[PDB]
Amino acid sequence: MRECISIHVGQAGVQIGNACWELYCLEHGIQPDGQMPDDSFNTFFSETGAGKHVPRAVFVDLEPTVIDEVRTGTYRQLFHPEQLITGKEDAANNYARGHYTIGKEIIDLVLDRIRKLADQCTGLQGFLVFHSFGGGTGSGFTSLLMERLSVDYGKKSKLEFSIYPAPQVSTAVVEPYNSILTTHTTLEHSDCAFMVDNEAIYDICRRNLDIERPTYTNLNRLISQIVSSITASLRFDGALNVDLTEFQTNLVPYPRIHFPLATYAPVISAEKAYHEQLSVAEITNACFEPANQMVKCDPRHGKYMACCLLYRGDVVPKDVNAAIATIKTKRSIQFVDWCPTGFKVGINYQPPTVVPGGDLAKVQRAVCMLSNTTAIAEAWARLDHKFDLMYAKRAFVHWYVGEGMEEGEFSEAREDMAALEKDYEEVGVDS
Amino acid sequence: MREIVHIQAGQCGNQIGAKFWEVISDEHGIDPTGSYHGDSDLQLERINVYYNEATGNKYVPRAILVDLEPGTMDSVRSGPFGQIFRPDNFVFGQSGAGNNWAKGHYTEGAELVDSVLDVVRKESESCDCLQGFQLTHSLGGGTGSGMGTLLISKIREEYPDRIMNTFSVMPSPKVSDTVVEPYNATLSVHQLVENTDETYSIDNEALYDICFRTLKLTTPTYGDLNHLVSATMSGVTTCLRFPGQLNADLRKLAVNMVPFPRLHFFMPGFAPLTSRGSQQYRALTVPELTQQMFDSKNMMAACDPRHGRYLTVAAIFRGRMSMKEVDEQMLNVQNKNSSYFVEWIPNNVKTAVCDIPPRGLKMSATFIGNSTAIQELFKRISEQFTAMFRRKAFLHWYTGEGMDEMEFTEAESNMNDLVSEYQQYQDATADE
Amino acid sequence: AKEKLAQKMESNKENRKYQEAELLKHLAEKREHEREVIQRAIEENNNW
Numbered sequence: 020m021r022e023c024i025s026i027h028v029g030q031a032g033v034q035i036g037n038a039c040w041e042l043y044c045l046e047h048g049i050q051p052d053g054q055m056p057d058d059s060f061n062t063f064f065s066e067t068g069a070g071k072h073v074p075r076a077v078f079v080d081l082e083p084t085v086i087d088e089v090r091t092g093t094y095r096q097l098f099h100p101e102q103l104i105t106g107k108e109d110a111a112n113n114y115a116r117g118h119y120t121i122g123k124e125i126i127d128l129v130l131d132r133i134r135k136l137a138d139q140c141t142g143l144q145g146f147l148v149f150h151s152f153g154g155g156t157g158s159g160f161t162s163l164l165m166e167r168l169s170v171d172y173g174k175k176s177k178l179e180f181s182i183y184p185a186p187q188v189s190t191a192v193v194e195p196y197n198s199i200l201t202t203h204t205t206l207e208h209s210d211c212a213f214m215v216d217n218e219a220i221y222d223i224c225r226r227n228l229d230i231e232r233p234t235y236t237n238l239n240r241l242i243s244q245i246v247s248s249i250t251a252s253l254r255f256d257g258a259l260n261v262d263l264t265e266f267q268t269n270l271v272p273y274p275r276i277h278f279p280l281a282t283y284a285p286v287i288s289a290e291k292a293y294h295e296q297l298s299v300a301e302i303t304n305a306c307f308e309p310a311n312q313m314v315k316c317d318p319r320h321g322k323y324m325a326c327c328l329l330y331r332g333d334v335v336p337k338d339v340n341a342a343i344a345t346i347k348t349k350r351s352i353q354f355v356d357w358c359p360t361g362f363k364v365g366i367n368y369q370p371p372t373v374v375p376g377g378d379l380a381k382v383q384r385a386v387c388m389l390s391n392t393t394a395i396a397e398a399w400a401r402l403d404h405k406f407d408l409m410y411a412k413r414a415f416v417h418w419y420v421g422e423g424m425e426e427g428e429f430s431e432a433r434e435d436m437a438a439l440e441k442d443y444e445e446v447g448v449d450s
Numbered sequence: 451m452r453e454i455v456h457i458q459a460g461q462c463g464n465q466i467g468a469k470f471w472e473v474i475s476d477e478h479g480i481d482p483t484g485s486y487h488g489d490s491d492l493q494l495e496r497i498n499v500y501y502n503e504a505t506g507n508k509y510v511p512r513a514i515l516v517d518l519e520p521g522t523m524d525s526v527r528s529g530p531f532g533q534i535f536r537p538d539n540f541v542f543g544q545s546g547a548g549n550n551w552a553k554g555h556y557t558e559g560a561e562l563v564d565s566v567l568d569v570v571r572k573e574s575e576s577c578d579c580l581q582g583f584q585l586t587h588s589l590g591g592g593t594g595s596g597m598g599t600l601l602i603s604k605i606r607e608e609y610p611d612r613i614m615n616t617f618s619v620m621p622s623p624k625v626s627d628t629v630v631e632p633y634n635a636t637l638s639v640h641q642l643v644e645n646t647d648e649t650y651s652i653d654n655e656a657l658y659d660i661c662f663r664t665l666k667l668t669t670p671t672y673g674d675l676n677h678l679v680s681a682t683m684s685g686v687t688t689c690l691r692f693p694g695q696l697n698a699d700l701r702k703l704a705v706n707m708v709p710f711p712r713l714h715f716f717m718p719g720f721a722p723l724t725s726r727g728s729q730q731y732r733a734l735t736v737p738e739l740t741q742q743m744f745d746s747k748n749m750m751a752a753c754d755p756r757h758g759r760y761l762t763v764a765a766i767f768r769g770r771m772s773m774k775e776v777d778e779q780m781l782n783v784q785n786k787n788s789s790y791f792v793e794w795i796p797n798n799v800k801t802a803v804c805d806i807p808p809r810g811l812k813m814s815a816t817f818i819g820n821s822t823a824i825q826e827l828f829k830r831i832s833e834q835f836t837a838m839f840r841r842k843a844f845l846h847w848y849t850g851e852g853m854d855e856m857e858f859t860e861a862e863s864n865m866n867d868l869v870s871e872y873q874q875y876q877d878a879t880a881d882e
Numbered sequence: 883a884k885e886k887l888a889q890k891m892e893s894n895k896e897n898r899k900y901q902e903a904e905l906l907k908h909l910a911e912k913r914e915h916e917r918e919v920i921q922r923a924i925e926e927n928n929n930w
């Protein structure tokens with residue numbers, strides 16, 4: 020019944036996967052061994068003959084290090100060994116190595132494992148793909164896998180949770196190249212993609228959680244909370260829900276304009292105890308503050324095409340509508356002329372769950388706003404400009420060419436990005 | 451990506467290589483018998499990058515020791531950590547190279563090369579996932595220089611997809627054992643431009659100047675110079691041998707450091723500067739460590755970084771310090787010294803911090819820079835070369851080995867092109 | 883989607899196999915010089 024398969028690619032994807040699955044277990048009362056003493060959780064967890072609950076997920080990395088930590092870790096019994104796939108040689112922050120050279124060896128094995136999970140599904144909805152834009156595996160292997168998934172799965176829904184690179188935490192000079200190459204190749208294969216800018220997450224951890232030097236552990240716990248908010252509607256049956264198809268129908272007006280901006284609230288530090296309880300009005304107001312965004316950009320300089328508000332916990336429809344009405348009186352929120360109905364609201368009964376010993380405080384109510392704004396084009400522009408700086412001099416190009424890539428693939432990828440930026444511009448013009 | 455195969459060639463190569471192994475063994479808590487006696491799990495986490503685990507608790511360097519002369523090998527075996535090395539891994543000739551690149555590259559070296567490749571193949575086929583090779587040698591001699599570059603070419607033939615890394619020591623008139631060093635160096639530079647993925651340009655001119663001027667050692671010995679080499683080698687390899695995010699393997703380092711194939715010559719830097727005896731010392735804070743990145747006084751290549759521009763920089767901080775302070779200080783230096791970093795390579799300075807400091811120091815900093823100022827080192831070699839070549843002085847030593855004048859003209863022209871290439875990117879602008 | 887996948891990979895081996903054989907072509911060329919000089923080294927000598 021309505022199953023969803025989660026694929027975690029590369030270090031970023033695997034590490035975010037660890038955070039997501041830890042949070043899902045806390046939310047559904049599943050122990051780290053898969054034991055549990057609704058029924059919708061079955062969309063994400065299958066059940067074995069021993070009454071154990073197993074994530075409907077595949078973890079893939081071209082290097083074994085990251086995944087070796089999962090198979091030694093607290094949740095080693097949660098996953099069956101066959102769903103934790105590792106190679107020997109990494110993609111060395113090279114899209115060409117991930118996509119071609121190294122990727123081509125493991126691709127068939129990864130798809131065989133995905134096929135085995137799909138065979139356990141009676142009503143497979145589709146896939147959730149987690150990866151970084153910057154790493155060779157996250158970029159190169161993901162686009163290779165996405166292409167192969169379109170072939171094997173027909174017209175099956177594929178949603179992404181993409182880690183947009185940040186210099187505060189960046190590991191490679193070539194991340195703009197890998198980002199553009201993966202976006203070009205994956206664009207025609209993805210139905211909806213939620214970008215997560217590591218700088219936005221880094222700044223929220225610093226500002227809201229008072230963490231001087233945020234680590235991936237800090238970043239992922241926060242990321243996991245947003246992913247859980249998007250997936251709560253699939254894993255639970257509330258008063259107001261949204262399936263794989265309804266997300267896309269409400270937020271995606273055109274094929275290529277499939278990049279919603281996520282905004283989450285409240286993000287409160289586990290200290291204090293006075294900084295709560297926030298009302299529905301207060302958390303809704305926080306969604307329109309650029310400081311709570313998952314991608315750095317300015318919506319006041321762009322136009323909205325769709326706004327989805329996903330509430331969780333002690334929330335009443337009357338409270339929500341009152342909050343939306345006051346926000347509508349703040350003229351500053353501009354929508355495209357071809358869009359009337361701006362607000363689609365969903366309420367899921369379960370209050371946000373937090374990891375014990377975590378940085379996040381337990382709240383009675385939270386909200387995740389998914390908005391399709393033309394302001395997200397600003398994130399593409401930043402990436403495209405960094406690509407252009409290096410590409411004008413063909414700096415580092417030899418690394419890709421050496422692996423069998425052609426220079427033409429770089430031109431093609433960049434022209435496609437130029438067309439994407441042009442698409443966001445065309446969409447914001449009035450008729 | 452796991453194992454690195456280390457090769458030591460010639461007098462200099464073996465001397466520096468032996469010191470590298472005693473330094474890193476001490477850091478990884480390995481005694482001269484191969485037994486681990488440390489008390490930190492970080493020491494063993496990535497031990498497999500440089501050591502093979504032999505039967506039981508013992509660790510053996512994945513090192514091949516090469517020379518055309520037997521004496522140096524005997525000196526290594528006799529040494530402090532001499533017993534740690536794999537007996538079968540010592541490959542030595544009887545007929546030396548006599549500080550003649552032609553003997554090392556074409557004659558005597560060619561005769562020994564196959565016996566060396568046989569030992570490197572044994573080590574390589576034992577590997578789960580070979581990253582590549584690391585060669586320590588001098589460019590002024592005959593074995594390290596001529597045979598070393600011959601080995602690079604032969605290894606490249608058999609392992610064309612592995613990373614080729616070198617620690618190449620540049621000759622200097624300040625600490626010269628032969629008048630023909632400019633010829634040997636030029637002939638070797640020609641080979642490295644074409645055959646390595648990354649070369650750490652270790653300049654004896656800079657090492658002598660540091661010892662004499664900074665360490666106040668009136669008469670520096672190779673032991674004094676090698677103490678600086680081993681401190682640098684320990685620093686630049688920190689990322690490969692301890693758990694880390696940045697430049698964790700040879701390929702990732704190369705991919706982040708090398709924008710153009712031929713521009714793979716690194717200018718290493720180190721702070722604080724210490725002398726063998728100096729176990730004092732009481733100094734070095736984070737702002738202090740960071741300031742020495744632009745300090746010509748701290749460069750292992752005799753070039754002023756302020757005479758050029760950095761294409762890419764890797765900076766490794768070691769010891770117990772604030773990661774926040776490091777990030778602030780590093781950003782301050784890039785903002786203050788904007789003009790010494792290329793604008794067309796965004797976020798080109800990458801930093802890593804390792805909790806384990808090197809021996810004797812509580813805090814240290816290692817810099818790996820890909821700077822256009824490295825052209826000063828190559829210009830120096832070209833002018834020394836031309837002064838001799840103009841008069842065809844000592845050419846009989848090379849032609850007598852079967853070499854032709856053209857090879858000399860070609861090596862020189864290739865090296866001048868390399869200088870011209872650094873100058874081209876020094877003058878390049880982000881006008882796009 | 884089959885000819886887009888196969889043809890992108892047609893160009894991969896066409897490239898990567900050649901871009902490590904353009905390599906070994908000169909690695910032939912320099913050993914073509916090893917004993918082009920080594921024997922010249924005897925034809926100078928076993929000639930005087």
Ligand SMILES: Nc1nc2c(ncn2[C@@H]2O[C@H](COP(=O)(O)OP(=O)(O)OP(=O)(O)O)[C@@H](O)[C@H]2O)c(=O)[nH]1
Pocket residue numbers: 028029030031032034035080081082109110111112113151152153154155156157158182183184185188189190194217235236238239242
């Ligand atoms: N949020 C987050 N970002 C991460 C994490 N790990 C890596 N990243 C980011 O992802 C990029 C680096 O790519 P990686 O995922 O580490 O690399 P990879 O996919 O394993 O690929 P290769 O190592 O080259 O084979 C940088 O922008 C990092 O900041 C993580 O746990 N969380």
Ligand SMILES: Nc1nc2c(ncn2[C@@H]2O[C@H](COP(=O)(O)OP(=O)(O)O)[C@@H](O)[C@H]2O)c(=O)[nH]1
Pocket residue numbers: 459460461462463465466547548549550587588589590591592593594595619620621622625626627631654672673675676679
């Ligand atoms: N730093 C350093 N340089 C050395 C050492 N021994 C020799 N050299 C230098 O290496 C060059 C001479 O080459 P050498 O390695 O002795 O000859 P080979 O045995 O034929 O490789 C000159 O530039 C010397 O100054 C040493 O132990 N340390």
Ligand SMILES: [Mg+2]
Pocket residue numbers: 029030082109154156
């Ligand atoms: Mg990785």
